[PDB]
Amino acid sequence: EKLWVTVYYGVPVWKEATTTLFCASDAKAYDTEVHNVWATHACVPTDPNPQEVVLENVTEHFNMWKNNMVEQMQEDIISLWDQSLKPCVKLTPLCVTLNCKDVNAERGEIKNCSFNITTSIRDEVQKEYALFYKLDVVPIDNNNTSYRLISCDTSVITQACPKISFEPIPIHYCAPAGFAILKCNDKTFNGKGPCKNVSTVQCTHGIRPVVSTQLLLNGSLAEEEVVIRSDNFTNNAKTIIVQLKESVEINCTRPNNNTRKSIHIGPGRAFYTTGEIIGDIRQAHCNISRAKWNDTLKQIVIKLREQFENKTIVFNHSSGGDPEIVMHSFNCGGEFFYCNSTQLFNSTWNNNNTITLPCRIKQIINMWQEVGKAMYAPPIRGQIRCSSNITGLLLTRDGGINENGTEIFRPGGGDMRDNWRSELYKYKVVKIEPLGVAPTKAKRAVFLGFLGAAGSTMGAASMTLTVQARLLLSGIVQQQNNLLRAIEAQQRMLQLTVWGIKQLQARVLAVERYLGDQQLLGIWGCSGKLICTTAVPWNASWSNKSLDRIWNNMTWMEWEREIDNYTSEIYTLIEESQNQQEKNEQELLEL
Amino acid sequence: TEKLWVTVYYGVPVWKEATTTLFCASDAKAYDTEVHNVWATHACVPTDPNPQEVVLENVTEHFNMWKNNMVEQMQEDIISLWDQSLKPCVKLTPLCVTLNCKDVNAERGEIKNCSFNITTSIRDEVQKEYALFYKLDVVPIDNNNTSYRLISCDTSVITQACPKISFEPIPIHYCAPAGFAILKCNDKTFNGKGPCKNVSTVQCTHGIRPVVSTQLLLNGSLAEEEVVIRSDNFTNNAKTIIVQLKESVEINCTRPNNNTRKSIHIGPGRAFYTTGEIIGDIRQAHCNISRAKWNDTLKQIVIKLREQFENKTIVFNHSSGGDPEIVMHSFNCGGEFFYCNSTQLFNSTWNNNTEGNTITLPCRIKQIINMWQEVGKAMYAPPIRGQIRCSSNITGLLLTRDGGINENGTEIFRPGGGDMRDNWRSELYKYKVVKIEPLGVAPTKAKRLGFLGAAGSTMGAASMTLTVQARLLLSGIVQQQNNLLRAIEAQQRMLQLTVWGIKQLQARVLAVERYLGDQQLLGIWGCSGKLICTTAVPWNASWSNKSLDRIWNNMTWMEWEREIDNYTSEIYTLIEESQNQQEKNEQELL
Amino acid sequence: TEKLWVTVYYGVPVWKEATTTLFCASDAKAYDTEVHNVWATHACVPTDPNPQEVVLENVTEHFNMWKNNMVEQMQEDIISLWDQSLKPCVKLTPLCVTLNCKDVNARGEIKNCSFNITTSIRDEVQKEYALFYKLDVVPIDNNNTSYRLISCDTSVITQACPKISFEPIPIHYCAPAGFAILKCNDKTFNGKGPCKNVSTVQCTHGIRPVVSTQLLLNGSLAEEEVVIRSDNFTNNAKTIIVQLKESVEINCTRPNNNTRKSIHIGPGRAFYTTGEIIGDIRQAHCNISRAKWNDTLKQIVIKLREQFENKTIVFNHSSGGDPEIVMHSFNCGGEFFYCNSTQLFNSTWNNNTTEGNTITLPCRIKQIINMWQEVGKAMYAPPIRGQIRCSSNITGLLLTRDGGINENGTEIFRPGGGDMRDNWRSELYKYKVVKIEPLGVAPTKAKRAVFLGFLGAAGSTMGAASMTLTVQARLLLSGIVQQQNNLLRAIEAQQRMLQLTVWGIKQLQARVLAVERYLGDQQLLGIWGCSGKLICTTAVPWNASWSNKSLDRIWNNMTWMEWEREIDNYTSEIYTLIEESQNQQEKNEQELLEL
Numbered sequence A: 001e002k003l004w005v006t007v008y009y010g011v012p013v014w015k016e017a018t019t020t021l022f023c024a025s026d027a028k029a030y031d032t033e034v035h036n037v038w039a040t041h042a043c044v045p046t047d048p049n050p051q052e053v054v055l056e057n058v059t060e061h062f063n064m065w066k067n068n069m070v071e072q073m074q075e076d077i078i079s080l081w082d083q084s085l086k087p088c089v090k091l092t093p094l095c096v097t098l099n100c101k102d103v104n105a106e107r108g109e110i111k112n113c114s115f116n117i118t119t120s121i122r123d124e125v126q127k128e129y130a131l132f133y134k135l136d137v138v139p140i141d142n143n144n145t146s147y148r149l150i151s152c153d154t155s156v157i158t159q160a161c162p163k164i165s166f167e168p169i170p171i172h173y174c175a176p177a178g179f180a181i182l183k184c185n186d187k188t189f190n191g192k193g194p195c196k197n198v199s200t201v202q203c204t205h206g207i208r209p210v211v212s213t214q215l216l217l218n219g220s221l222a223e224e225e226v227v228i229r230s231d232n233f234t235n236n237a238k239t240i241i242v243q244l245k246e247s248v249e250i251n252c253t254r255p256n257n258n259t260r261k262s263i264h265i266g267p268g269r270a271f272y273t274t275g276e277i278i279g280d281i282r283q284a285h286c287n288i289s290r291a292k293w294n295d296t297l298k299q300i301v302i303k304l305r306e307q308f309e310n311k312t313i314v315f316n317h318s319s320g321g322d323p324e325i326v327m328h329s330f331n332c333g334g335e336f337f338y339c340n341s342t343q344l345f346n347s348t349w350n351n352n353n354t355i356t357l358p359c360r361i362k363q364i365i366n367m368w369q370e371v372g373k374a375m376y377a378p379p380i381r382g383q384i385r386c387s388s389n390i391t392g393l394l395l396t397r398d399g400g401i402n403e404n405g406t407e408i409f410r411p412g413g414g415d416m417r418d419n420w421r422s423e424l425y426k427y428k429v430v431k432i433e434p435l436g437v438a439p440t441k442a443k444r445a446v447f448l449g450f451l452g453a454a455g456s457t458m459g460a461a462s463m464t465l466t467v468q469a470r471l472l473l474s475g476i477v478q479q480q481n482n483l484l485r486a487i488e489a490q491q492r493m494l495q496l497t498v499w500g501i502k503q504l505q506a507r508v509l510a511v512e513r514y515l516g517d518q519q520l521l522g523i524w525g526c527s528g529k530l531i532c533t534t535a536v537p538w539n540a541s542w543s544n545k546s547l548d549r550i551w552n553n554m555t556w557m558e559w560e561r562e563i564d565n566y567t568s569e570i571y572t573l574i575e576e577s578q579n580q581q582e583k584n585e586q587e588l589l590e591l
Numbered sequence B: 001t002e003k004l005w006v007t008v009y010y011g012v013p014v015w016k017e018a019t020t021t022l023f024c025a026s027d028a029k030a031y032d033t034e035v036h037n038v039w040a041t042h043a044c045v046p047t048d049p050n051p052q053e054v055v056l057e058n059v060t061e062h063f064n065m066w067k068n069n070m071v072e073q074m075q076e077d078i079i080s081l082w083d084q085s086l087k088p089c090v091k092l093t094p095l096c097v098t099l100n101c102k103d104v105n106a107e108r109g110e111i112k113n114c115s116f117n118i119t120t121s122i123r124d125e126v127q128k129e130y131a132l133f134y135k136l137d138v139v140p141i142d143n144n145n146t147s148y149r150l151i152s153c154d155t156s157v158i159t160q161a162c163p164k165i166s167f168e169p170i171p172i173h174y175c176a177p178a179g180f181a182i183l184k185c186n187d188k189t190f191n192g193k194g195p196c197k198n199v200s201t202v203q204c205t206h207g208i209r210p211v212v213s214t215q216l217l218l219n220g221s222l223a224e225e226e227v228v229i230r231s232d233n234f235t236n237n238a239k240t241i242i243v244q245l246k247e248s249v250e251i252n253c254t255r256p257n258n259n260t261r262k263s264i265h266i267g268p269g270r271a272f273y274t275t276g277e278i279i280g281d282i283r284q285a286h287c288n289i290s291r292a293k294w295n296d297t298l299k300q301i302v303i304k305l306r307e308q309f310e311n312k313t314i315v316f317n318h319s320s321g322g323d324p325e326i327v328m329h330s331f332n333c334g335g336e337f338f339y340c341n342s343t344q345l346f347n348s349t350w351n352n353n354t355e356g357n358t359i360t361l362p363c364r365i366k367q368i369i370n371m372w373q374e375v376g377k378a379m380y381a382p383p384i385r386g387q388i389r390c391s392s393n394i395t396g397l398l399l400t401r402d403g404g405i406n407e408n409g410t411e412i413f414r415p416g417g418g419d420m421r422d423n424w425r426s427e428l429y430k431y432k433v434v435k436i437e438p439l440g441v442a443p444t445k446a447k448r449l450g451f452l453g454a455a456g457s458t459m460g461a462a463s464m465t466l467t468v469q470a471r472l473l474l475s476g477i478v479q480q481q482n483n484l485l486r487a488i489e490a491q492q493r494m495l496q497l498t499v500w501g502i503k504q505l506q507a508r509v510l511a512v513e514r515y516l517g518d519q520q521l522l523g524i525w526g527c528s529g530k531l532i533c534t535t536a537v538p539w540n541a542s543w544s545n546k547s548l549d550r551i552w553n554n555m556t557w558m559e560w561e562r563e564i565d566n567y568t569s570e571i572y573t574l575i576e577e578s579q580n581q582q583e584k585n586e587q588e589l590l
Numbered sequence C: 001t002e003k004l005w006v007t008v009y010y011g012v013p014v015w016k017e018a019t020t021t022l023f024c025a026s027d028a029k030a031y032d033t034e035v036h037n038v039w040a041t042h043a044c045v046p047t048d049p050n051p052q053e054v055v056l057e058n059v060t061e062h063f064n065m066w067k068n069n070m071v072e073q074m075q076e077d078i079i080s081l082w083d084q085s086l087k088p089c090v091k092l093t094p095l096c097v098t099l100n101c102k103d104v105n106a107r108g109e110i111k112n113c114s115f116n117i118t119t120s121i122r123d124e125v126q127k128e129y130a131l132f133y134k135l136d137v138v139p140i141d142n143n144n145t146s147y148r149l150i151s152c153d154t155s156v157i158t159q160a161c162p163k164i165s166f167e168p169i170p171i172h173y174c175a176p177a178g179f180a181i182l183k184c185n186d187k188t189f190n191g192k193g194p195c196k197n198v199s200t201v202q203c204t205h206g207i208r209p210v211v212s213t214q215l216l217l218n219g220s221l222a223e224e225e226v227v228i229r230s231d232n233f234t235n236n237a238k239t240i241i242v243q244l245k246e247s248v249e250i251n252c253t254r255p256n257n258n259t260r261k262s263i264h265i266g267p268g269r270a271f272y273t274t275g276e277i278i279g280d281i282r283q284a285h286c287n288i289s290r291a292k293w294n295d296t297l298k299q300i301v302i303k304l305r306e307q308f309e310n311k312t313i314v315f316n317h318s319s320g321g322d323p324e325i326v327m328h329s330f331n332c333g334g335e336f337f338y339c340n341s342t343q344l345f346n347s348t349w350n351n352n353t354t355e356g357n358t359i360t361l362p363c364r365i366k367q368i369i370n371m372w373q374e375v376g377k378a379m380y381a382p383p384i385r386g387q388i389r390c391s392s393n394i395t396g397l398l399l400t401r402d403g404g405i406n407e408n409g410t411e412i413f414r415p416g417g418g419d420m421r422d423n424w425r426s427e428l429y430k431y432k433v434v435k436i437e438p439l440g441v442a443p444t445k446a447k448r449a450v451f452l453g454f455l456g457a458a459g460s461t462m463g464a465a466s467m468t469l470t471v472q473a474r475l476l477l478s479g480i481v482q483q484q485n486n487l488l489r490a491i492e493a494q495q496r497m498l499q500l501t502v503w504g505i506k507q508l509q510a511r512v513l514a515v516e517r518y519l520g521d522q523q524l525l526g527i528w529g530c531s532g533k534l535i536c537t538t539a540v541p542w543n544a545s546w547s548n549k550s551l552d553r554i555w556n557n558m559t560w561m562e563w564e565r566e567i568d569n570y571t572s573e574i575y576t577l578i579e580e581s582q583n584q585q586e587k588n589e590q591e592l593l594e595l
C-alpha cells in the first residue's frame, strides 16, 4: 500500500568521488608547429562558450588538501615531461672528467672547459670547447685541478631536443561526461572549511602550468582583499600559501648576445653547447619598483597579525640547503634562472623603486624526489627578456620557539605538488548519478545548472532540472567535446602518447556508464516515463525510515542520499520484485 | 497455420567454440600493499568477491576437451607478464668478464668467489670486487685459466630482477567477459579428450596457482578418488603423458647455510646485488622424503599402468643426459630456484607375481636461467639473506614412453620433463570457452534452473533466467559481474601500465559490442525486449519438414541449429524486409 | 495535402567525403601461413571470402584523383610498419670503423675486407674475412685502399632480423562500419574526372604493398589500350605514370651459391655476412624480349599522340643524378636490386608527323639501403644463401615532362623516378572513401522484389529509394562484428608480440569509432524522441521558405545527394528548432503526465 518506491531519474544529487579528468587545449589561436612540451600539438579545440549557474544554497566543505586533482595531474605533468624527453638523445658518453678555465672576466663566473672525448666510433680525440659556469661543475681533488659535472656521478642526464618550446599554454582541465566540477566563488576560503557562492562548470578555466619556485607568477589575482591560506598554523611543520591581489609585475632579461655551436658526437648526436658571446656580461638583474614591495608587505602583516593575537611578526631570509629550495629558481623565456632573494626579506617590522637581484642561470635540472634522471636544456641564442605578473608567495614558519613571542618566517619552496594547489583551490570534482530513491504519497523558469537546491520539492521544478541535464548526457557537436564530428575525422593520432591513453580512456568511460545506466534502468523500468511506478511495491517492512510527506516537503535530499547506503538491500529487492512480477505475466500469454 | 511462422527467441543455451581473452580475479587477503613487490600479477588488480556459481548435471556430450584455447593464451600471457617485470629492471652490462675464480677449503665444487677486475661505466677507473658464485653458473676452459664466464653471455643479455619483488603465486580466477560461459567436466572417472557426462558450468575458474614447474607437479590440484592418467595418443612415443595423484606427497626443502648481501656499484642507477658473505656452516641444500609413502604410492600407479595399457613389465629407468633442466628437478620456492639430481628414485622394475626410512635427495642451486623456447632471454634472482624453509604438496608426475624393442623389457617410462606449456594443461584439463548467441529461430504455429538450465527439455520460462545473465553485462554496481566499484577505481588511475588492463578494457569493449551487436538485430527487427517477438511470415519447408510434435518436445535446441539451420543467413533478410514493407504501408499509405 | 510535417529518416543512403582510420583484410593468411615473420612485418585479420560488390551505374560524381585521401594515410602507415619490425632488431653500431680491403680475383665489384673489431668484453680480431660489394663503400682517399661505409654518418647500423622475409601479401584495406569504399567501373576515364560506371566495395582488391623505381610490378591491367594518368602542371613539369594494357614479364637471375656466416659482436647481437662463394660468379641479369617491348612502346607513342597531336618522341635516359631512381629497385629474394636502363632507352620514334630479340641488363645490388624523405636511419640487408632467381610481371612505368624548347618541335621524355608515395598513388586511383550520414530529413508525404546491396537505391529512383532502408543498416553501419570481430579472435590474438601493433591499435580505434557513431546517432534519436522505430513524424509545419518545390519532383526523380545540399543551409536550424518544439510538447507532456 502507497508503493513507497520510485527511481526518480531526474534528480541532481552527487557523490564525492574521484574519476579521470579530460584534457584540453586552446591552440586554435596559435597553431605553432613547434609543439610546446605541455600542449604537445593541440589536445582538442576548446569550447567557444562555457556555462555556469550559481547554486546558492549548497555549502559543501572542500578540503583542498584532499583534492585528487592535485595528485592526478602531478603524475601527468611529470609523465608529459617524461614522454617528451624520451625520443631525444642523451649524454651518456659525455661524462668524462674535464679541465676547465674561466673566461677573461663577473668574478670568474663563466668558465671555458677543454676535454678529451671519443665522440664518434671513428676514434676521435680533440680538446673540445665547452663554456659553462660554476653552478654545474663540481671540482675533484682540489679547487683548481679537476672538474666534472655536479650530476652524472649518480644520475642520468639527457639533452632535450631543441625544437619544442618551453612556453606554458593556458589549458582547460575538463570533465569527460556525466560527472562534473564545482567552483567556490566566495572569498576568504582558507581551504579547510565550507565555502559559499558555489557554481559548477565543465572545464576549469585557463590554467597555466608554471614551475618556478619561491614565488608565484602568472597565477590568478583574486581581485578583492588579500587572503592567505595554509593547512595549519599550530602544527608549525606545515606550509603557508600566500595569495595576493595587487598584480606586481617584474621584468627580467639576459644581458648579453650569444650564439649556438654544436658538438657532433655520432649518429643522431649533435650536442648543443654554449656557442659564443659578443659584448659584456651582467648577472641578469631584476628590478621590482620596491615601493610596491615596501607597500604590499604592510598589507600582508595586518592580515596575519590578527591570526596570531595582534603580536610581533617579522621576516628573515631562508636558511641554507638546496638550490631548488631556498634560491628563487625561475623559468621564463625558456631558459631557467636562479635569483638571490636576500634583498627582499631583510625586513623585520613590528607596528608603531629600483633594485638589483644578482641572479644566476641553471642548465642541468635534477629530479625533485629522485636521484635518477636529470634534464638538460640547450642555450638560446642572442638576448632574451621576460616580464610577468607575480601573484602570491610561498612561505613557511620556523618551528623553534624564541624568548620574544614573535614569529620568524622563512620562505617556502621545494615542492612541485602544492604549487598547483593555488590554481585548484576553488575546484572540486564530484561524481554524478541520476539515480534516486524516494517514496511517493501524491497522485499515482529555466535553470541551466546541475543543481536546484530545493529538495523540499521533488516536483515543482526539482524533477525538471536533470531533464535538462539529460541533454548533457547525449551530445555530438559543441555540446560534448569528444563526439565532435570534425575532430574525429581529424584525429588519426597514434595512442602511444599520453593523449591516447587519456583520450580514449574518457571515451570508453563515457560510453560504458551511459550504457550502465541504460541497462540497469531497462531491466528494472524503462525510461519512457521518468517516474517508475507500475505499482512497484511498498517498503515499510524493513525501510522503516520514520517520516511523513510534509517533512519530505520540507527537507533536502541529504538523508535521501544516505538511506540505501545503510539499506541498499531495499534497492536490490525491488530488482527481484521486478523479476518476480514479470515472471508470471508474460509466460501467461505464452501458455 | 502449420506453415512455418518464423519467430525469434531470445534466451536459449546456444553454444559455439570461441577464442576470447579474459580478466583476472582475486582477493585482498594477501594484498599487504604489494601490487608491485608481488610478481608479474600486480596482485591480480581486480577483485573476486565470491565464487557464486551453479553447475549443471543434465546431459552427456562430446567435447574432446584436450584441444583448447586457454592454454596457448596462458603461454603468451605469462611470458609477457615476465617481460613486464624486467623492463624497468637494469641490465648486467659487463658480461664476458675474466672472473679469476677460486675458493678456500677446496664438500667440493661449492660456492666460490670470482674477483671482478672491471671498470665502471661512469669514470675510467679499474677496480676489484669479491662475488660469491655456485658451480652451476660459470664455464671455464682448461680448469686453471680462470676462464669462467657467465653462461648466457654469448646467448643474449641478462638482467637483474628489481630485487624488491617477491615470487609467490596467488590463486587467481579466470573470468570470462560476460555473455559467455565456461564449461567443465566433473562427472568422475574421466581423462583427456572424448565425451564427458557432466555439463557443469562456472563463471570463473578455481584457484589456479601458476607456478612454472619441472618434472613433478607442485601443489596444483590432486586427482579424484582414483589415480587417473589423461587420454593422449598411446602410439607414436611423443605425447609425454602426465598422471595426477590421488593422495598428496609432502616434501620440505631448505638450504642449511645462512648468507648475507652486498651491493656493487657499476654505473648510473646500477647498484648490483650479490651474495654478501656466509656464516660458518657450508652444507649443501637437501630434500628429504618418506620413502615408505613413496614405496606405497608407486604400487598404486603401476596398477593403473598395466591394466589400462599393456600388462606385462615396467622398468623405470631414469632419463638420460641432455638438457641441464629436463634431466634434474628444478624446483622453485621461497622465491628461489634449485636443481635436483633425482637419479635416486627410478631404479625399479616391476612384474605381477614377484612383488607385494625417509630418503633424502642432494639438490643444487644455479643463479642463471634461460628462456626455454628462445635463446634471447635470461634472468637473475637476488640472493636472499638468511635461510629458507618451505614445504610442498606433490600432485602429479610427467611421463615418457620410449623403446623400440620390448621382448627384453616391455615398458620404459623415463621421467618426462616439461615444455612449460603442459603445466596449464595439468590444470586446464577440463575447461572450454563458449560463446552464446542468445537469439534463435524456429516455427511457431501462431502468426503475428541454473546458469544454463535445461540442455534437454523445453523452455517454459528458463530463457528469462538467461536474460539477467545477459543484462548483468554492464551493471556497474551489481556485484557479480565485476562489481565495477573498486574495479573501476583500481584501474582508472593506473591503466597506464598497459599489461593487464589492456586485457580489461578489451574485455570491456568486447562486452559492449557484443551487447549492441545483439541489440542491433533486435533494434532492426523491432523486437526490443518482449523475449518472443512474434511475427507473421509463412516460411517454406525447403529447410525442415517435420510434424508439430517432435520439433517441439522431443528434441532440443542446441542440436537445432546444427541439424537444419544451414546455408541460411537469408532467413534473417526475410524477416528484415517484412517489417519495412509492413511499416511503410502502415505509415505513408495507412 | 498541406500537413507538411517533417519526417525523420534513418538510413537514406547518402554519403559525404571524409577521413577515417583504416582496417586490414588479408584472407591469404588462412590460405598460406608459412612463417610468422612476413606476418610479423604484415599481421592482419582474415575476412569473409566472396564479398558482395554492388554496382550503381546512375550516380557519376567527380573522383578527386591526386588529392585523394588514402595515399597519405597508408604512406605514414607503412613507414611505421617498417619501423615496428626494425626496432627490436640489433643495431650494428661499432662497425663504422675503417675497413682495409683487398681485391678478390679469379670489373672488380665484390671485394674482401679486413679491420679491427672490439667485441662484447675483451677479444680483438686481426683480419675479419668481411666481403663487400662495390656500391656500399666510400674511399676515404682515392689512393687509399681503406674504405668506409657510405651512409655511416647517420644510423646505418640497423640490420633486419634475418629470420624475417620480405614478400608481399595481397592485402585489402577496409574502413569500419558507417563508411564505404568506392570504385570506378568506368573504363579508364583519366586521372581526374567524373566517371559513369561505379559500384560499392567494402574492402578493396588485392594489393601488393611493394616499392619500385621507374617501374611498377604486379599491379593491374587495362581492359582497353594503354592508358595514362596525369594532371594540369604535369604539362608544365610534374611526373606522369604509365599503365600498360597487358602484362609483360621478366625473369631475373641470381649470381650463384652463397654462404651465411655469422660474426660475433657482443652480448645479444651477432652480425651476418657472406661467408663463401661456390664457383665463379655471373652477374645478376634480367631477361626480356625486345619484340614485346617494341610492340607496346609504339602504343605509348599512340597515347603521347592521342595527347600531343601526333608529335614525334625521344626517350633520353632519365637524369644525371639520383642513384636511387636512375636504376631499378626490387625486393624479391629478400634482396634489393639495381639495373642500368642505359641499354634500354636507345630509343626514338618515326617522323610520322634487329639482333638478339631478347635483351639483358647489366645489374648490381647493394647491401645497404636508405630512406630518402629524411636523412638519417638506414637499413642493412642480410645475405641470402642459395639461389636468388626471380621473376615478376611488368605493368607500369613513371615519366617526367622535361619542359623546355630545344629543337622547337620535339620533346624529351627522360623516364620519371619518384617518391614512395606514387606507387600506391598509381593503383589506388579507382578508390575513394566516404562516410554515411544515415540520418535523413525530408518532408512528409500527403497520403496518410529484386535484390539491392549497400547503396542499391542510392543510384536512382529516389522516392522509391525510401523502401528497403535496413539493408543500408544491417551490414553497412550495423554489423560492427562483420569483419572487426568475426574471424580475428584467435589468430591475430595468437602471438601479437607486445600486444600493440600498428594494426591492432587502429583496430582498437576502429571498433569504437563505429559505436561512438552508432551510440551518437542513437543519442540524437534519444534526443529526438522518435527512437525504437526507423522513420517518424514530428509536429512542425515545413515552411515553403525551405523548398517551394512540387512534391512530385521530390518523391520521383530528385537525387538525395543533391537533396541534402539544398537542405544543407537550414540543417542547424531544423535540428534545434524541432527538438525544442518536441521539448515544447514534452514540457506539456509531463504537464499532462505528472499534473
Ligand SMILES: *[C@@H]1O[C@H](CO)[C@@H](O[C@@H]2O[C@H](CO)[C@@H](O[C@@H]3O[C@H](CO[C@H]4O[C@H](CO)[C@@H](O)[C@H](O[C@H]5O[C@H](CO)[C@@H](O)[C@H](O)[C@@H]5O)[C@@H]4O)[C@@H](O)[C@H](O[C@H]4O[C@H](CO)[C@@H](O)[C@H](O)[C@@H]4O[C@H]4O[C@H](CO)[C@@H](O)[C@H](O)[C@@H]4O)[C@@H]3O)[C@H](O)[C@H]2NC(C)=O)[C@H](O)[C@H]1NC(C)=O
Binding pocket: A167, A168, A210, A212, A217, A218, A331, A332, A333, A382, A386, A387, A388, A389
Ligand atoms: C607569464 O606571462 C607573461 C605575459 O604573457 C609572459 O611575458 C610574456 O612573454 C612572452 C613570451 O614569453 C612575450 O612575447 C614575446 O615577446 C618578445 C619580445 O617582444 C618585444 O620586443 C619586440 C622587438 O623589440 C617587439 O616587436 C614586441 O612588440 C610586439 O609584442 C608586444 C607584446 O605582445 C605587442 O604589444 C606589440 O604590439 C608587438 O606585437 C615586444 O615589444 C617577442 O620577441 C616574442 O615574439 C617572437 O616569438 C614568438 C613566439 O614566442 C614568435 O612567434 C614571433 O615570430 C617572434 O619570433 C621572432 O623573434 C624571436 C626573438 O628571438 C626570434 O628568435 C624569431 O626567429 C623571430 O624573429 C614574443 O612576442 C611577451 O612580450 C611577454 N609579456 C610580458 C608582459 O611579460 C611571461 O613569459 C610568462 N612567464 C611565466 C613564468 O608564466
Ligand SMILES: *[C@@H]1O[C@H](CO)[C@@H](O[C@@H]2O[C@H](CO)[C@@H](O[C@@H]3O[C@H](CO[C@H]4O[C@H](CO)[C@@H](O)[C@H](O[C@H]5O[C@H](CO)[C@@H](O)[C@H](O)[C@@H]5O)[C@@H]4O)[C@@H](O)[C@H](O[C@H]4O[C@H](CO)[C@@H](O)[C@H](O)[C@@H]4O[C@H]4O[C@H](CO)[C@@H](O)[C@H](O)[C@@H]4O)[C@@H]3O)[C@H](O)[C@H]2NC(C)=O)[C@H](O)[C@H]1NC(C)=O
Binding pocket: C034, C035, C164, C165, C166, C167, C168, C208, C210, C217, C218, C330, C331, C332, C333, C383, C384, C385, C386, C387, C389, C390, C391, C392, C393
Ligand atoms: C610479384 O608477385 C609475384 C607473385 O605474386 C612474386 O613472385 C614470388 O617471388 C618470390 C621471389 O622469387 C618467390 O619466393 C621465394 O622464392 C625463392 C625461390 O624458391 C625456389 O627455389 C628454392 C631453392 O631452390 C626452392 O627451395 C623453392 O622450392 C621450395 O618452395 C616451393 C614453394 O614453397 C615448394 O613448392 C618447394 O617444394 C620447396 O619447398 C623454389 O623452387 C625461395 O628461396 C624463397 O624462400 C624461403 O623463405 C621462406 C621464409 O621467407 C622460408 O620459409 C622458405 O623455406 C625459404 O627459406 C629458405 O631459403 C632462404 C633463402 O635465403 C633461407 O634463408 C632459409 O634459411 C631457407 O633455407 C621464397 O619462397 C615466390 O615463390 C614467388 N611467387 C610466385 C607466385 O611467383 C614476385 O616476387 C613479386 N615481385 C615483386 C617485385 O613484388
Ligand SMILES: *[C@@H]1O[C@H](CO)[C@@H](O[C@@H]2O[C@H](CO)[C@@H](O[C@@H]3O[C@H](CO)[C@@H](O)[C@H](O[C@H]4O[C@H](CO)[C@@H](O)[C@H](O)[C@@H]4O)[C@@H]3O)[C@H](O)[C@H]2NC(C)=O)[C@H](O)[C@H]1NC(C)=O
Binding pocket: C055, C056, C057, C184, C185, C186, C187, C197, C198
Ligand atoms: C560496368 O558496370 C557494369 C554493371 O553496371 C558491369 O556489368 C557486369 O559485367 C560483368 C562482366 O561482363 C557481368 O558478369 C558476367 O556475368 C555472367 C553471368 O550473367 C557470368 O557468367 C560471368 O562470369 C564469367 O566471367 C567472369 C569474368 O568477368 C569470370 O570471373 C567467371 O568465372 C565466369 O567465367 C560474369 O560475371 C555482369 O553480369 C554485368 N552486370 C550486368 C548488370 O550486366 C561491368 O563489369 C562494369 N565494368 C567495370 C570495369 O567494372
Ligand SMILES: *[C@@H]1O[C@H](CO)[C@@H](O[C@@H]2O[C@H](CO)[C@@H](O[C@@H]3O[C@H](CO)[C@@H](O)[C@H](O)[C@@H]3O)[C@H](O)[C@H]2NC(C)=O)[C@H](O)[C@H]1NC(C)=O
Binding pocket: C055, C056, C057, C058, C456, C459, C460, C461
Ligand atoms: C538507375 O537510375 C535510373 C535513373 O536514375 C533508373 O532508371 C529509371 O527507372 C524508373 C523506374 O523503373 C523509370 O521510370 C519508369 O520508366 C518506364 C520506362 O519508360 C515507364 O514505362 C514507367 O512508367 C516509369 O516512368 C525511369 O524512366 C528510368 N529512367 C532512366 C533514365 O533510366 C534505373 O532503374 C536505375 N538502375 C540501377 C541499376 O541503378
Ligand SMILES: *[C@@H]1O[C@H](CO)[C@@H](O)[C@H](O)[C@H]1NC(C)=O
Binding pocket: A103, A104, A105
Ligand atoms: C684573456 O684570456 C687569456 C687566455 O685565457 C688569458 O691569457 C688572459 O689573461 C685573459 N685576459 C684578460 C684581460 O682577462
